[PDB]
Design a protein around this ligand. Structure first.
Ligand SMILES: Nc1ncnc2c1ncn2[C@@H]1O[C@H](C[C@@H](N)CC[C@H](N)C(=O)O)[C@@H](O)[C@H]1O
Ligand SMILES: Nc1ncnc2c1ncn2[C@@H]1O[C@H](C[C@@H](N)CC[C@H](N)C(=O)O)[C@@H](O)[C@H]1O
Lengths: 376, 376
């Protein structure tokens, strides 16, 4: 192994709260931290968690090519891992969703034979689903960088979700601290008008970045986007959501090969029918709650404090994880108050072992996770 | 206002660590918690954080329609909010990404005039980007439910990312505790063979669910998926990633209207060229680091412990947030050790105010966030 490592983590979109527990812990454990966040509470929070932090935001500048900024961000990180330190990069939202420097820095680090990992985080698209009450599954989701969408004239699906990032800097390769002059926005408004028509809805989406703020979820027509006062509101943290125009009919060849509207309807879709919550199926399913008992093959949790504790520290304590990863058996034996089954399950590391150790597994089942929460 | 509320939060995919700080805090604050998670460490962790929890997983059953399960899950939650309690639903990953019961339960609750919110979380798609080292921006991302993809014969873009959820239960509307017999998987393998050809790569992706485990990132050909031993490995937590076959050429009409390969290349793309990290642009940008000083319009953090504290509790303490949301001024005045500017910025709640209170704003700038981290 070569000394030094790079881990890139996210903070989520909304200030502090949308940081994951493993992001925070890796930040605490890092030798050097490099961060690029928008809001200052998040920044100040980060600075309390590690002493050796560097704000990457200072490598932006007026008129300066973002590509140069990204090279610089990524070089600054890889330099400290060549020195043998464990360095953590931090980017708002999800650190790999519309982010050049993370992918760049990890790819460089792995080519030189350093351990490199990205930990996922809550993206602005994630926030979009939550705030606009839509699900990517229904009826599919297409996601593009607004400029890339235009330059490679990427195809659109009228019967699916369309999400467009960086609508506030169409064609702009550089930066400005007072914001962009998004003067080529009308080119995008032309493209959407072509594909969706002038009265198709467009949702201007900006997720709250502070806990007390409401998101922006404003609905305009495509034509409205050309109005100067409306386009003015589109900025650097603007995302567009373009709902489907219609529902696509089901294929009859396929339904037969497989031998075969869910509430609620997508409210942003223009001509949605009202969908009923309590149809007969729903009525019947609900009546069954009265006498409902857990199926035979259901596995109730049956664990101990010692076991839940050790499984928590493995997830929250990167040091504990490193010891366990180095030797399952030695680690297992040294953790106190474990039953022989708990201690055995840690020794294997097996998902099955750990489920059997932590759950009251029924005989039927004994002789593999299955939790599907969407149906089409 | 009507008493009672519903908040749906996520736990992320990897056990405990991928839960966000605001998810955890709402779980702690809730009157009643209903959860649907895969792994038992996450479950046990949740049970330590609130006393009144109900496992929703017991409303699945062999042969039982998932739609009935989802109606039941959602009804159980809305029932407790009709009783006037503040109830939190918990679903693994992102609670609104391929999840019927969350959207269903919130839509019912809002139609009856109860406060209803979804908080986003780390999806399996989020984990995919991180583990497979890809970025949705480059070169766009299409995401479908595998059965929906077939039934509505949804169009594919050969020049973009394709992500397919629920590849392990093609056409299966029901549940089984010992896993699905995914016997109509060959229908999907036919569709992919049609659109991509028999030697196009397909990545079988399963994110580690436990901190010590490695993800599955196995690359098969489309033809290989028909081999019984290979299709056997596809399960309930399987996702497919289908890379682009080629790069789409740039539109010349559009580049002119806008008056106009980034390292690293997508390693899963079949015929990728090798991309250079240190081209001249990169060389030059890096040399500028030696004499680099923060631009004039850069705003260094300049805050106080009292201010960072209060901004942290607003994000981590839903009670503190509720008081602040009820009256900015009263709340601001009652928090100790705030400077007049800090205390004034809280009073307004304004993003600008709070940035000015927490950062040393340069004169130039004084007279609006802009943090774009991808370039095309
Ligand atoms: N608060 C927000 N609301 C909506 N979209 C946002 C927000 N912040 C960032 N974005 C989107 O993300 C783009 C900036 C990206 N370079 C970074 C995205 C970030 N990594 C994420 O996880 O979402 C912006 O142009 C927006 O399209
Ligand atoms: N560990 C995992 N690795 C890869 N994909 C997964 C994993 N767990 C769940 N999934 C995907 O999610 C589907 C189940 C969905 N109903 C729930 C998705 C979940 N809400 C999320 O945020 O990803 C599975 O069929 C997979 O396609």
């Amino acid at each position: 192994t070569k000394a030094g490592s790079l881990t890139i983590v996210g903070t989520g979109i909304e200030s502090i709260g949308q940081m994951t527990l493993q992001a925070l812990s890796y930040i605490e454990a890092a030798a050097k931290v490099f961060y690029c966040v928008i809001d200052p509470a998040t920044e100040a929070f980060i600075l309390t968690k590690n002493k050796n932090c560097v704000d990457l935001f200072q490598y932006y500048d007026n008129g300066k090519s973002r590509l140069n900024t990204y090279t610089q961000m990524s070089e600054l990180m890889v330099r400290e891992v060549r020195k043998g330190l464990d360095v953590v990069g931090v980017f708002y939202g999800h650190p790999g969703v519309f982010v050049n420097p993370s992918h760049r820095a990890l790819a460089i680090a792995k080519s030189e034979g350093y351990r490199a990992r990205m930990l996922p985080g809550v993206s602005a698209e994630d926030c979009l689903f939550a705030d606009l009450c839509i699900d990517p599954s229904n009826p599919g989701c297409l996601t593009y960088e607004a400029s890339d969408f235009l330059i490679r004239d990427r195809p659109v699906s009228i019967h699916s979700h369309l999400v467009l990032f960086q609508v506030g800097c169409v064609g702009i390769a550089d930066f400005n601290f007072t914001g962009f002059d998004n003067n080529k926005f009308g080119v995008l408004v032309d493209r959407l008008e072509q594909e969706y028509g002038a009265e198709h809805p467009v949702v201007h989406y900006i997720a709250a970045m502070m806990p007390h703020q409401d998101p922006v979820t404003d609905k305009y027509t495509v034509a409205q986007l050309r109005e100067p006062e409306i386009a003015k509101r589109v900025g650097g943290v603007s995302t567009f959501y373009i709902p489907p125009k219609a529902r696509k009919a089901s294929n009859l060849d396929i339904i037969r090969r497989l031998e075969l509207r869910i509430y609620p309807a997508n409210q942003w879709e223009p001509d949605v029918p009202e969908v009923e919550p309590y149809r007969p199926s729903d009525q019947a399913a609900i009546a069954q709650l009265a006498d409902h008992a857990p199926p035979e093959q259901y596995q109730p949790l049956a664990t101990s404090k010692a076991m839940s504790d050790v499984m928590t520290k493995l997830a929250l304590d990167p040091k504990a994880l490193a010891d366990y990863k180095a030797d399952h058996r030695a680690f297992a034996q040294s953790v106190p108050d474990l039953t022989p089954q708990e201690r055995a399950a840690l020794e294997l590391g097996d998902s099955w072992a750990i489920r059997c150790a932590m759950k009251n597994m029924p005989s039927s089942l004994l002789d593999f996770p299955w939790v599907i929460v969407v149906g089409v």
